[PDB]
Amino acid sequence: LHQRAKIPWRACTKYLSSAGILLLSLLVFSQLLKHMVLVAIDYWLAKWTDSALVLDQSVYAMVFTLLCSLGIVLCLVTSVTVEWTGLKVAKRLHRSLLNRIILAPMRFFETTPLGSILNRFSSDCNTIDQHIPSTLECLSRSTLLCVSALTVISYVTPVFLVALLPLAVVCYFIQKYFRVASRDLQQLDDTTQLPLLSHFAETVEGLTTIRAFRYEARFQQKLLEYTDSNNIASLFLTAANRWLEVRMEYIGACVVLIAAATSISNSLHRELSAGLVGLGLT
Amino acid sequence: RRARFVSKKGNCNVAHKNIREEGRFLQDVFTTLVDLKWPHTLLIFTMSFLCSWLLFAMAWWLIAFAHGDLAPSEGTAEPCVTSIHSFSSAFLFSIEVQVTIGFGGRMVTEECPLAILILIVQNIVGLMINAIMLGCIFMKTAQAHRRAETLIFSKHAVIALRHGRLCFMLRVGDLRKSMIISATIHMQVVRKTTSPEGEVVPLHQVDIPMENGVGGNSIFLVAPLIIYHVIDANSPLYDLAPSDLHHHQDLEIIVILEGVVETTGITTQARTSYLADEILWGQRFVPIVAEEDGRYSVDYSKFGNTIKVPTPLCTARQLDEDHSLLE
Amino acid sequence: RRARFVSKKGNCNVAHKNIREEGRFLQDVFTTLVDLKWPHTLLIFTMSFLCSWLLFAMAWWLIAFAHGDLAPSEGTAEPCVTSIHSFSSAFLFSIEVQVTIGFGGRMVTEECPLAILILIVQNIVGLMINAIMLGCIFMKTAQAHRRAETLIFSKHAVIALRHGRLCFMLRVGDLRKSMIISATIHMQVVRKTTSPEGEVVPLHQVDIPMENGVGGNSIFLVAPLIIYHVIDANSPLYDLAPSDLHHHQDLEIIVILEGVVETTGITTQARTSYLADEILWGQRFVPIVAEEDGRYSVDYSKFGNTIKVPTPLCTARQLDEDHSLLE
Amino acid sequence: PLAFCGTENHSAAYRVDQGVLNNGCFVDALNVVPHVFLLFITFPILFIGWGHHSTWLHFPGHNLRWILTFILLFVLVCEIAEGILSDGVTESRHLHLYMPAGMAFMAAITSVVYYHNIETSNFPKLLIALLIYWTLAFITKTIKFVKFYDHAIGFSQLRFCLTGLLVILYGMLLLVEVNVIRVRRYIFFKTPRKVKPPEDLQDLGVRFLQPFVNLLSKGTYWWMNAFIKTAHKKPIDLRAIGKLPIAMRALTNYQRLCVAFDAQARKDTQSPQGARAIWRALCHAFGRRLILSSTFRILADLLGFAGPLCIFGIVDHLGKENHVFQPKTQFLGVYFVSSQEFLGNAYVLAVLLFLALLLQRTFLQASYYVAIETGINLRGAIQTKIYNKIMHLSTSNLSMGEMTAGQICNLVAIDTNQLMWFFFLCPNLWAMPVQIIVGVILLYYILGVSALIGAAVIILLAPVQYFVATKLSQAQRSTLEHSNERLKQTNEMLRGMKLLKLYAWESIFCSRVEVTRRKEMTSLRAFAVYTSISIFMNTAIPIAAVLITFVGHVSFFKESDLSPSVAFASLSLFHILVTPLFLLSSVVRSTVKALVSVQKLSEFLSSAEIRE
Lengths: 282, 327, 327, 612
Ligand SMILES: COc1ccc(Cl)cc1C(=O)NCCc1ccc(S(=O)(=O)NC(=O)NC2CCCCC2)cc1
Ligand SMILES: Nc1ncnc2c1ncn2[C@@H]1O[C@H](COP(=O)(O)OP(=O)(O)OP(=O)(O)O)[C@@H](O)[C@H]1O
Ligand SMILES: Nc1ncnc2c1ncn2[C@@H]1O[C@H](COP(=O)(O)OP(=O)(O)OP(=O)(O)O)[C@@H](O)[C@H]1O
Known about the structure:
part of a larger assembly, 4 chains, A: mainly alpha, about 90% helix, about 0% strand, B: alpha+beta, four-stranded antiparallel sheet, elongated, binds ligand GBM, binds adenosine-5'-triphosphate, diabetes mellitus (chains B, C), ATP binding (chains B, C), ATP-sensitive inward rectifier potassium channel 11 (chains B, C)
């Protein structure tokens, strides 16, 4: 149970260390700088609109254009960097796995099943080659966007941190419980998908024998049981997903209510500009 | 048609006629007062309090008139009770003295001793009727008849072969966590029986023994357990054929559960009946208890489900004769 | 794993599922109200009193507004209730009338009859709910479930040879000077038993007879005395080998002590259980009573101490067969 | 101190001589009555019940009364907001403007909880309290509405509209309670109609209790709390996961699909198992639930624009210099806020934004769940249909080679899955056009033609995402072919590894496996390039759109000057519009794959069969 609920920190560390110091450093720097540039773009929009409210407008337009162009360039840089990192890690990892499997003693091949060795090269290599780069990019971008957004709405309203702490605790508990439940449900969903397809194959290649024994009804009932197991696994997985999403959207509703109320109070009679509350609201 | 001695919910359907009441029904007045349903009891007690208030209001108003306190006066004389100007003042004052609120705008003074005597009498009878109502609804609050409604019996009783012998089986369960302490079960066969001398009794009740390890009538009811009576050589159901289990057969088997509630410490009684059509042959109750996740779980959805079991379709006397033939 | 029917402290571990409640759990509302733990019961009753006070405070405030007593009057009008200036005055007045303190700064006058009617209604319902709470916690004050916790059973039961025959022995004691009047003990063997016809019951309870001189179930419990069941030819523990006394053996022996308290006169029930591992073989309880300085003294420090005694390590059926071989 | 009517003109609002019923704060106090009564009766019952397993049932009008009470809570929040908003000018606090509405809000929540505990315990005779409460609330609200009409209060003042909504809602809830009386005769009838809970709910082993919980528990998925908290304690297996409810079972959905197929086959007999017939059968089988999901999705799409609109209103109000709010209309010495100046306040727009998002995201998740559940039911029914076709097909066509085991295997594996995933994304088919069109219209009204230019550039994301997705799919197809060859070589090497160890023939095989790996890497480089292009376009087209719309608005068009309200509302509109535009290409590709999958499934179902 302790190993089940444990995030594979060592595996992620080895995966990122196979990329090299230069490429990983460039990836981290590009991601952080790009999200800072996006924050700068929206903050400059707030200052621009405040200046137009009080009303160097061409200077404002030129700085906004420069910031947006820098953001587009850095988006290209971070996309190319994360895909390059995935390619390099995939190549090095497959080469190392092939060489180490080759150097293994014959006792290892005699005792261990062929499926365990080959499933790495088939499924785990495919996952590392294709799915992990995009998932790593999505996780990095979403985490940095959430952190930058919380930082912005805490910058416009410093009193938001007081309400941010209990919301952070509640969100942490929600995501922990969802992660353990969702891991179990996803694994169960795949393991329920497998025997249904195997049953379809077995029935097709042995149809004459099945119909000669008059075992059509029994095999149909077996199929009904298999697909009911797959359906209930899928339904529990999507119910857990909707549970998490409802909780997160309600947390976001509380966040926008607190940020709105505090920013309106600070903007009415505490000398906060309208652009900053609009920034925090978005 | 086919009148039953006791209903399925335990209500007794006997009509009682030509009862020479000699006041014995209302001499036990407090039992009636507890036995009234709750809106009736509330109506009785609010009516008694209102009647006492109105009677002593009339007394106070009469005293205030007879002392001249109702006539306006300059101020030489002092009233028996201050500020009694009409019957409304007397009614408010009677309420004040009897419920002991005592606002003090209208108070008894020392002028006429009749007001003092009426004050004494009103306080005595107010404490008296307050005590009477209090004790009556303390008995009523302690009634365990609603605790008897959450003791369920199976709708169908079954006769199945158990240990090579016929057994009349029923299931009784309890829905609450509260125990029923010293739970005893009495079972009867209510049937019109004719004596060999020609004596005909219409509702003859024969106590049938519940099968028990100690040979008595005592159950420990936490989970719903099957109550069964073993049909042996000396039993009223000895000649009970499968064909006798139809609606217009003179046969009713009442079951009387009894015991005290763990909470109130008051003996309660739950009961039910089984007519001949309600008794099933060749069936036995499904297993209702399961061990789930380190606890014994009872699935009450399968409380009265029976599975049709191959049992010999002949009465237990024929089973004894046929078994002696085989042996 | 190894779910037990009743715990060592008497708690029943049965989970009840799929209970079609038809309001029967809350129709017995007074049993629930007594059964709530003491902080919950206090919370219910203070909330009910506060709700009644607030509701009639709203009534008094509404009447005082509708009569114009809340406005600064011209000085001629007489209020329904004197000195009601806000909702706080109405709340204090509602408290005064319902608890019958009656300070009299705010009192009902004879001006509007609606105030008189509300006074009548508030007094009636105040006496009513005061009576309801009073009776509920009089039942709660009389609960003997805490008196069942001071009746102790030995943690280990023992099977030892007594008078040339196997006996399942346990010790029960009472810690208080107060007697438990008409103390009866019921013992069961709770075990999943399979009938010869194929009927499988999961929690089959078989009443085993407590060995007594009069052949019944009645004990006189002053000093802790050893309760023992004689394993004879017709007993559920007849084929109970020493090897069967392990944790994952389907065997539980529950013991149910019952009786009324000498103080409150209310029947209480104490219980415990003994799994197969909790039953010791070849041991018997140490003597616990001694005669010290002209009195019989009980040393409760040796309440559950057992001495390993040489007994035959075979079941009682084998004892009967082997004894018939020797005889 | 606090006064109910307020301390004005030496408390002249407490004067009642003119008529007690036409005094405004006395009928406002009469309004408080039913709420206090409801709290008084219902609190001890709930508190006693809060001090086993029930297999609850649902009373008639359950969904209707949950919807009605949600609307009631929204209207009572509006009542509290306008009451607080309308006494911001007077020195004394008028409690009667918002405190009756606050106690009404508390009483409505209490009524929902009390109804839930009545419904679970199945004791409908406790609904007498709800009947009395709805009667009293409806009567007092009707008195307030009638006295408002008698005192020349029209629809210009918001409080009149809100109290009319309250009259209508209390009447509807009273009608729901009377309908509960009529259907289940717990009062006035000699024998009540006994109703048993559903048979799949009584099954100890059905643990997907979504169709049986209440409407709030269906929208918030509150029944998953116990399941997930237990899943933290112990791992989930095929036993902790229960049995399917009867509504969602392969036999049930398959029989429903068979009924739909028979109804379709009666109409057109030229091709009873063609693609059109299968599509019409799927519509007849699952269309009500599909349009329920689409209704939730459309309502969520419309309510999601309350974000930018409330942002526009809030920042427009906060951008107003020296704002001096003072409601012009005053009746009976009591101020009334009109509807135009009600929605001009930043606080109530924030509160309405909170409520609108709270409702909108719940509706979006409900649409997602209904679409997923119907896709899963369709997958079960379609798999049962395919397997029933398998039991009858002749093995001669298996011999001829027009079918294999692999063809039927992938017909279940990817084709049924594609149809299921299309039914997942089916409400998007008209949700995304509606949301995109309404968003572009709101962009035009908020900002102008510059927003039209920016919206055109952000709409350009969908065709380029479609092109990049097509190139990505074919690049991964080439990668799949090379990976299959590499797995073939690796499998042969691993199986002949003993002989390779014997002859020291490893590195020569490593060279060939690595040559295949290098060619696979050459394909995977193009795959990763197109993935990077997709990511860059998705995360850079909104930046370009925002840049061009604001720069063109201030420089090229030279329109009305940029304000924080319009700019941040437009930015929120772009943040809303980016996601459906990105997923539109995936939805279109899913629709095309669904058409191909249904055609393939029709060609399978229209094949040869053994004779009877
Ligand atoms: C996240 O969606 C969207 C986001 C934006 C837009 Cl504009 C449209 C959609 C959309 O069209 N969404 C409806 C369809 C949908 C699909 C997956 C998910 S899900 O939660 O990510 N995943 C699962 O539930 N998978 C279950 C697990 C068992 C097998 C497959 C079903 C949630 C919903
Ligand atoms: N119809 C009746 N209703 C109520 N009680 C009755 C009735 N008949 C007799 N009893 C009671 O039965 C008892 C007398 O027994 P029995 O049936 O022989 O009556 P009895 O001799 O006619 O009566 P009594 O002794 O009053 O003259 C008394 O307790 C009497 O109250
Ligand atoms: N799941 C349950 N929970 C609580 N009580 C139950 C349950 N099932 C049956 N009962 C009770 O058992 C008795 C009826 O016995 P039985 O088990 O045969 O049920 P039934 O015939 O289905 O019920 P009903 O008579 O209400 O239609 C009634 O007192 C009923 O309240």
